[PDB]
RNA sequence: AGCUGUCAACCGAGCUUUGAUCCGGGGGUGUCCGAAUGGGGAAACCCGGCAGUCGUCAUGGGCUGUCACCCACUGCUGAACACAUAGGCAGUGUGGAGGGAACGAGGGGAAGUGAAACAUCUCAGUACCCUCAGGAAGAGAAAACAACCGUGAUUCCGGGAGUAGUGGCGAGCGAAACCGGAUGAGGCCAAACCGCGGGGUUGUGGGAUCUCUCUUACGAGUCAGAAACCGUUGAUGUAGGCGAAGGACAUGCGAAAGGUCCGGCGUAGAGGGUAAGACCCCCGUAGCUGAAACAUUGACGGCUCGUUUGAGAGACACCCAAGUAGCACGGGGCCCGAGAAAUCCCGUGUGAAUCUGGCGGGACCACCCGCUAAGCCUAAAUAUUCCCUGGUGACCGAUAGCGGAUAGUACCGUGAGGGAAUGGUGAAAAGUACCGCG
């Protein structure tokens, strides 16, 4: 996922653990990987 | 002979001097050369004798200070030079040209 | 400076009744003594502590 | 340079003589104004430099 | 400097687009080349002193090799390839041929 | 596949696919001054000795090596004087000398200032100076804390805390116990006793010496516990290589990277250039790939070293760092400014003991607790950037930013020393041929 999506101009990538307020507000949409979503919520 | 104890007289004799005074001196069999500044009259005499196989009678040396020259940036100084005037025995000549 | 033990001079303060401090110096008690080092006669500056101890 | 390495010590000493003599003549010609190819002065000097290098290499057994 | 001396190139961005030409001389340090025919300037020189028309260098990134493919000419970019002895040979990329 | 550095154009002449220029590693040359070191000297100058060598009838003259002082060691000689030393002579040493931006240890040590004056005090153990270093330094394996419970070498960071304290109790100064963290490591000698070697290394005390009882190959290494080298090979460094994908139409003015339409790559939409805003024109980036040579550093083999009787019981009071500890005086530093002043350091006098020894636990005494001074070594956490490689900036953009878009130059001063100002044509010189007034 990192290597595939990092080059897209509009996509900003984060770890679940370093999800931060600034990135959330800038971004129009947030897309989690199921592994990421469970890691964050837990 | 080795590559450190090798000396050739042609190193002392840098080049001849071409000028009106030097030309005037040719007629009297006095040849003017520019020589290595570290040489003395004795070296000049031996160098000329070995290079040209001529009999040297007397050697005069003139030490000439380099001429200071102005530039865009400032002042430079040409190299200092030592000139030797070699008087040869009667009947002996050197073809410098 | 004792040439034997290396005892050097100490530095400190001379204190008055008014408690004004100034610099002074405690020089060791060094006496010039004729001694025999390695069978050769020689004159040394030695401190009386070394003399008392018999180091010379 | 390779062509030099095949010469004996005496041949190398020789070649140095002619090299030194040739530079001597070029310097005289240049001073008197008859030199045509200024590049030769540099060329002969480089040959002169080579011959010392090989002579020294043999002395040190490099 | 991929543009060698003596190649057929095409000016892609300049006063004179389209014009092909040979590479007269290349300056691989300032990244410019001379293509005979383009940027032909008229120098005002005095003493035969007079107007002289010769071509001035154009930037290397304003030309590009011309390789022949299926009849007419076509501009191509250049890559490299070793053959067997580690020898890079200019290989055209528009055609995949050997230039 | 071009090249002959730059200001900096220009001419001329050359080198180059028989591989130049350029780049990296190694090697040769390296005038004279400078610690300067054959002697001298106003640094870059002058004059020599000794050996060898070229040259000449020969002096004169060339060229190479070598010659300062101090220290370490080996030999000869040994003064006044007789041993004898001092000294002298000979032979060697990859010994020392000087330089360096900051950081370190140990010593010496201001004043302006504050105290609204000033001397105790502060500034401040700062500025500066002296000796010595290393890549770090210093410290460091308990004669330590604590408090009757206990922790267990040192260093550094945050607390404790601006607290206890200290102070012309003024201005000010200012811990420790202990807590949370970074890193984590322990070794060896002297002594007694035996012939520089063996011996042994302690705080539950241990060791020696004597008597009795029983018993009688292996590990460690380039390090603080010794020290080198030879090879094989792994990794990193000092040059590099490859590295994806864009066209058409019009406009513009002069140039398309901008407009319109359709496309493509993307483990590459970082950045810079290209004649105006370029992921696809170039240099690159993502991603891989590379070393004859030498450096750094691993692993291994050779190699080197250490050990090869041990344990218990009883004796004995032999040893356990001396002009030292303590004490007296005069001082320094610690929260502590000499005070009832402990511990720590210095000078002068006086001056022990060896385990029933000794030291500390804030005068002192007793008990209790801890620990063995007067010997040494020790990596890691810590401070710094003259220099090298790669990057960053809600840093500057030519009176700004370093003084310096190179300058410690010009200029000023005898001298230490002070010390500037000057960036911009255009995409490309296409830098105005020719004509005229002069």
TrEMBL record, chain A:
Organism: Streptomyces fradiae ATCC 10745 = DSM 40063
Domain of life (superkingdom): Bacteria
Function: Forms part of the polypeptide exit tunnel. One of the primary rRNA binding proteins, this protein initially binds near the 5'-end of the 23S rRNA. It is important during the early stages of 50S assembly. It makes multiple contacts with different domains of the 23S rRNA in the assembled 50S subunit and ribosome.
Range within the parent protein: 163 to 204 of 216
Family to which the UniProt record says this protein belongs: Belongs to the universal ribosomal protein uL4 family.
Subunit structure of this chain's protein: Part of the 50S ribosomal subunit.
UniProt protein name: Large ribosomal subunit protein uL4
Gene: rplD
From TrEMBL, chain B:
Family: Belongs to the universal ribosomal protein uL23 family.
GO biological process, one term: translation
Keyword Hydrolase part of the UniProt annotation: no
Function: One of the early assembly proteins it binds 23S rRNA. One of the proteins that surrounds the polypeptide exit tunnel on the outside of the ribosome. Forms the main docking site for trigger factor binding to the ribosome.
Keyword Ribosomal protein annotated: yes
Gene3D superfamilies, alphabetized: 3.30.70.330
A GO-annotated cellular component: ribosome
NCBIfam families, per database record: PRK05738.1-3, PRK05738.2-4, PRK05738.2-5
Lineage: Bacteria, Bacillati, Actinomycetota, Actinomycetes, Kitasatosporales
Gene assigned in the entry: rplW
Protein name (database record): Large ribosomal subunit protein uL23
Oligomeric form and interacting partners: Part of the 50S ribosomal subunit. Contacts protein L29, and trigger factor when it is bound to the ribosome.
One MF term in the entry's GO annotations: structural constituent of ribosome
Origin species: Streptomyces fradiae ATCC 10745 = DSM 40063
From TrEMBL, chain C:
Transmembrane segments: none
InterPro entries documented for this protein: Bacterial_rp_bL28 (IPR050096), Ribosomal_bL28 (IPR026569), Ribosomal_bL28/bL31-like_sf (IPR034704), Ribosomal_bL28_bact-type (IPR001383), Ribosomal_bL28_sf (IPR037147)
GO BP annotations listed: translation
Keyword Ribonucleoprotein part of the UniProt annotation: yes
Keyword Ribonucleoprotein set for record: yes
Cited Pfam families: Ribosomal_L28
Cellular component per GO, a single term: ribosome
Keywords: Ribonucleoprotein, Ribosomal protein
Single GO MF descriptor: structural constituent of ribosome
Family: Belongs to the bacterial ribosomal protein bL28 family.
Name used for this protein in its record: Large ribosomal subunit protein bL28
Organism: Streptomyces fradiae ATCC 10745 = DSM 40063
Gene name in the database record: rpmB_1
UniProtKB/TrEMBL annotation, chain D:
Keyword field contains Ribonucleoprotein: yes
Keywords from the named record: Ribonucleoprotein, Ribosomal protein
Single Gene Ontology BP annotation: translation
GO cellular component terms listed in the entry, alphabetical order: cytosolic large ribosomal subunit
Entry GO MF terms: structural constituent of ribosome
This protein's record includes keyword Ribosomal protein: yes
Stated family: Belongs to the universal ribosomal protein uL29 family.
Protein name, as recorded: Large ribosomal subunit protein uL29
Residues of the whole record sequence present: 7 to 68 of 74
